[PDB]
Amino acid sequence: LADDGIIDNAQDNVNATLKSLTKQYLSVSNSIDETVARYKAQFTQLDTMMSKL
Amino acid sequence: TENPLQKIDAALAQVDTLRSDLGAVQNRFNSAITNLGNTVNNLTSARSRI
């Protein structure tokens, strides 16, 4: 139950790992946002050029 | 066959080495799993980005 215990170090390592994975999730989320922004801008461009034609 | 104490010592050593092998295999497939997961997520991120 103390800090030196296997369970406490286990849960400390678990929270550290999930925080690193949360940083990775933030990276993937911003990449997703940028890619979606690009695709939606091109989709609006397609809509405008189809409206002209 | 006398001297059972050394045989008990051998049995407990066998238990300890089975524990060690179990942990070795555990971390072995943990490394394999994290490597394949990294490969999968890298592939999907590269595919979506480009």
From Swiss-Prot, chain A:
Q: Which residues cross the membrane?
A: none
> Coiled-coil segments, which residues?
14-42
Q: Which domain of life is it from?
A: Bacteria
Cellular compartments annotated: Secreted; Bacterial flagellum
How does this protein assemble?
Homopentamer.
Role played: Required for the morphogenesis and for the elongation of the flagellar filament by facilitating polymerization of the flagellin monomers at the tip of growing filament. Forms a capping structure, which prevents flagellin subunits (transported through the central channel of the flagellum) from leaking out without polymerization at the distal end.
Protein family (similarity comment)? Belongs to the FliD family.
- Name of the molecule in the record: Flagellar hook-associated protein 2
Curated annotation (Swiss-Prot), chain B:
Purpose: Flagellin is the subunit protein which polymerizes to form the filaments of bacterial flagella.
Q: Provide the protein name.
A: Flagellin
* Cell compartment(s), UniProt: Secreted; Bacterial flagellum
State the remark under miscellaneous. Individual Salmonella serotypes usually alternate between the production of 2 antigenic forms of flagella, termed phase 1 and phase 2, each specified by separate structural genes, fliC and fljB.
Q: What induces it?
A: Inhibited in nutrient-poor medium (at protein level).
Give the source's domain of life in one word. Bacteria
Q: Belongs to which family?
A: Belongs to the bacterial flagellin family.
